């Protein structure tokens, strides 16, 4: 058959599309609100009837941990067993992968207009790749090319210990360690991480924080209306660089460091002028090591759908 | 041919031996001093004539980064070209790998008597593996099993930003940051790292350090004759755990975390009584994640010779 089902479920939104098995091309993308449907398979059934095409294979990416037949969404009230949905749909293959796996698998399919470069030279072919994004949480994955095939290396890299460098970063660690216990990088590189950076900075002045959400941190920083909001956003960009620099040092990722969407596009212009690349290269003797490594921001509209098709096609035996 | 030459060359000494291409067994190992011979070629020639063996393939592990055809070592008189040496020796395959790459490739060859487990459950076959060792510097490598083949991922992971967790670790960062600026993990997890920890502890207590070498720190700590040295060795063991746990989270190293010799065997009993494993699992919500990941200390005599044979045999088509 010519088409397989591809998906990208991210909380309240379920995006489904058709993927050409021969080419990996995505088409007929439809987005359904998860609040209007009781199950993911209910959406898939509605989508399959509308396009009147027969599919036997499928690969859906979900923004939740996937290990075990029972997939449970972070807050959304969708939970299912992969085998039950496999039997109910009559599917030959039903791949259910983490959303960050799919995003990493889309990188071999991306062209340069889907990327924005932040410093560095050209990538080195055949070298490892680091992918990380700061959204609701801190997703981290790695990409390695072995024998014409792309293997995805998953993990929970977002929960490694936060590593402060400057003075200002050290006071933040001290404040957070007093409230929470171990302080992971996710506590400062994420949606809630922006608030944590804000709340820590306000308490650094021996004051009490004001209650506002990450969306209020961003536009107040961009409007120059709250001095603390711009301070936290600038520190968030610096910490994003330091984190990305550690990733490149650890795995020698001369294929590139990729930022996967998240909250960064909400302040793209502010991010462009920050000390992100400076903190990325602030590695002591090994600035020259990561100096030439390029950092790209993925601006492709649907990397989850693209990478789900790439992973499924490789599963079925195609070479990307 | 039955035998291939394998080698493990450092700053001053070159160890060469024979590898049974069928079994991977290392035999007839001899160490030569690089001050008595003008080139690495000369040492290989005298070995092959004083052992009367006749090899066609060889693989040598060198304690310096391998970037290109020219190998620039610490023994500058021995700097050579890979292609030139291959033509001079008449070899059909001459693989030149980093010393820490060879140690990581010894993992598939190691028996139970060469490993001491430090916590964790059984390893999961086919899952990634993290290797690190604290010697003169901090070497970090990763192993991935793809299509019946073991691939080594090199990097400079020992130079990522040091991540303090406890309040005592935070003050160490402040002390060192005022001296050298960027504080990588190598500045605490190494032979010189012991001295740095010792100086930072006494400086935190408003006292003046002595001019001690790493061997002094371990000696006083094991003899309980210096509380400063004892605290330094205790903190080293704890930071050793935290660093390894960060590696495990980042790449999901369910195939195990391996400590490659270094200075740890010199205080093995002190290491066993330390809070190493507890610091390894001090990962907040993800203590349960790294709880099942096993940690092994490698106590093999010559892992570089063992791993060099493994890499060469894999390159020659054999499956480990």
Author numbering:
A (entry chain B), B (entry chain A): 2 to 321
Task: Copy text verbatim from the article accompanying this structure deposition.
Here, we report the crystal structure of Escherichia coli glucokinase (GLK), which has phosphate bound in the cleft between the α and β domains adjacent to the active site. The phosphate-bound complex is composed of a dimer, with each monomer featuring an α/β domain characterized by noncontiguous segments: the small domain (residues 2–110 and 300–321) and the large domain (residues 111–299). His183, Ser185 and Glu187 exhibit distinct conformational changes upon phosphate binding. Diffraction data were collected at 2.63 Å resolution for the phospate-bound form (Rwork/Rfree = 0.191/0.230) and at 2.54 Å resolution for the ternary complex (Rwork/Rfree = 0.202/0.258), both at 297 K. A B-factor analysis of the phosphate-bound GLK structure revealed consistently lower values for phosphate-interacting basic residues in the α4, α5 and α9 helices, while significant root-mean-square deviation (r.m.s.d.) spikes indicated flexibility in regions preceding β1 and within the loop between the β5 and β6 sheets of the α domain.
To date, there are no ecGLK structures reported together with the other substrate ATP or the product ADP. This work presents the structure of apo ecGLK bound with phosphate and the structure of ecGLK in complex with both glucose and phosphate, implying a role for phosphate in regulation of the GLK activity. In the ternary complex, phosphate is bound adjacent to glucose, and the B factors for the α4, α5 and α9 helices were further reduced, while r.m.s.d. spikes were observed at the end of the β10 sheet and within the α6 helix of the β-domain.
